[PDB]
Amino acid sequence: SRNIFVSHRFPERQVDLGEVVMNFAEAGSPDNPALLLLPEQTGSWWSYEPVMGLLAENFHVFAVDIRGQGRSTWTPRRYSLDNFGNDLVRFIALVIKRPVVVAGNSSGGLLAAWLSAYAMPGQIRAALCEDAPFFASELVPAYGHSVLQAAGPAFELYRDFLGDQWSIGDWKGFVEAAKASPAKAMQLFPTPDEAPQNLKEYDPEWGRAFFEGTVALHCPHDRMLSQVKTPILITHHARTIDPETGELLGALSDLQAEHAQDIIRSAGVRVDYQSHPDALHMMHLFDPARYAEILTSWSATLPA
Amino acid sequence: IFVSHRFPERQVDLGEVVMNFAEAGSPDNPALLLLPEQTGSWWSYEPVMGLLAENFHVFAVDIRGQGRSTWTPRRYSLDNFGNDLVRFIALVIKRPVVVAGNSSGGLLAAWLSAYAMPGQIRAALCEDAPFFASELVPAYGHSVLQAAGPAFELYRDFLGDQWSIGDWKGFVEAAKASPAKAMQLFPTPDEAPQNLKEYDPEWGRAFFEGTVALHCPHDRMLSQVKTPILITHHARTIDPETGELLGALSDLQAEHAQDIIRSAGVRVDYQSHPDALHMMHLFDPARYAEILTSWSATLPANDHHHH
């Protein structure tokens, strides 16, 4: 329907980028440094709603709905990291019109790195990659677990039961397949009787693109990390190896994080790594005060 | 390996790609962005630019993976090509443009009409563009495997991504031996020509393997165009034995392309030039210049873009 939205504590506006009309919320005062917040997959801008007040003390915050999510345009067959990233390049150029710190969670953290490497010159001051699945979200990664061995199971179910643009919509089937899944990474997957608000706002073709290896086909992660041009902060939250299946539970393994750091270091840019092994994947949502402190303290070490 | 040209060249950093280009004419005339064919550098337009600079502010570009522009391993997609050009318009031209492209560049002219930033594109000239026929899974008619694919396969197999194999002699041998009717007229000089020395053959891999437009199905892209389109349709024939398409697109593919654009509610003009060579802008430059100039003069705001 694309008519299922609810109210939020910050006003929302939309901007025509040329193909996507991007929805976003704004917080904070425009005399403060600009901060672009990129949600996790299945998450709308309001994934950041609880933390935006804290960040508004110090930043001019723009939290966006990425294409295929929230009130931003759904674009069948066009889901790629490059299209996600170029939408954001346009958003910075058309809306923000200043250099930004960009912070993103999970797939959004992939896009924060993408911008550090591939944005227009001067657009990106620095990038915060909050529990980003470097390598582990690729179909054939250079290192470690692939998407099939990590976050893939839920993506397969989104595709098979919800379908591209919610064209199947079989939430009841999805829940019963999620409960029956032998993937240990599905063990704590929430299975409410009714689809949650964030999933109702989510184009499940996103999940297809991740599961099928098309989203990053043209953006191998080893190459993209070698092309970053700004300081990078990597936060690395909970992760474990399942002792029955060998699945990666979490965003990326220790080995994948080591390689991501090594590649960035070899590009000659500043890289900082923080391991928070008892934090949840979406620390900006489940521990806003800790996330805000991490981001604010690191941002204060960046050159003006 | 570059050679001299009669228009000075400049480079601009788009962020990932540093784009090389040649500029001619006065900014008092409408801005015109010229996009070469695959394997062609900006100077595919060098013989015709003098004619066009009489009436346009001309920018002829090296697309990523070609000429002096950055080669970008594993990143060759219509979207990445097109977004470079969005950035070029925003950073260099800073005015709305008429965009004219040959072959793959014509695909990218249509791409810009659909997907550029608001207001950047006034109109698109698609000069013998392989709509559908350059897809691996086209909505209509021949796939690339039954059209331009044979040469692309040989580029991949003998020249290699970023010229990493570089077996020009084996390439020529295989071209001569090809069973494809579409290779019958392919030039096989003893040394690689300048345009191909400037070409990253991963371009050919991306077309042959169906990765270049995986995320840009042509039926959907044509349905999203937002500006007037001029389609020129040069020589084409279907081989009666192999069914190969010799040419850029078939009559059936051109019919559907027009129909989809018309259904988008935009102006579309179609000119069939059945005896014209694929690169008319290079091999019949006076004719191409008249087509482009006469058509541009019919566009709304032609007067707004003279100063």
Author numbering:
A (entry chain B): 23 to 326
B (entry chain A): 26 to 332
Please give the exact wording used by the authors of the publication that reports this structure.
Zearalenone (ZEN) is a mycoestrogenic polyketide produced by Fusarium graminearum and other phytopathogenic members of the genus Fusarium. ZenA cleaves zearalenone [ZEN, (S,E)-14,16-dihydroxy-3-methyl-3,4,5,6,9,10-hexahydro-1H-benzo[c]oxacyclotetradecine-1,7(8H)-dione] to hydrolyzed zearalenone [HZEN, (S,E)-2,4-dihydroxy-6-(10-hydroxy-6-oxoundec-1-en-1-yl)benzoic acid], which decarboxylates spontaneously to decarboxylated hydrolyzed zearalenone [DHZEN, (S,E)-1-(3,5-dihydroxyphenyl)-10-hydroxyundec-1-en-6-one]. Furthermore, we report site-directed mutagenesis as well as structural analysis of the dimeric ZenARe of R. erythropolis and the more thermostable, tetrameric ZenAScfl of Streptomyces coelicoflavus with and without bound ligands. The X-ray crystal structures not only revealed canonical features of α/β hydrolases with a cap domain including a Ser-His-Asp catalytic triad but also unusual features including an uncommon oxyanion hole motif and a peripheral, short antiparallel β-sheet involved in tetramer interactions.
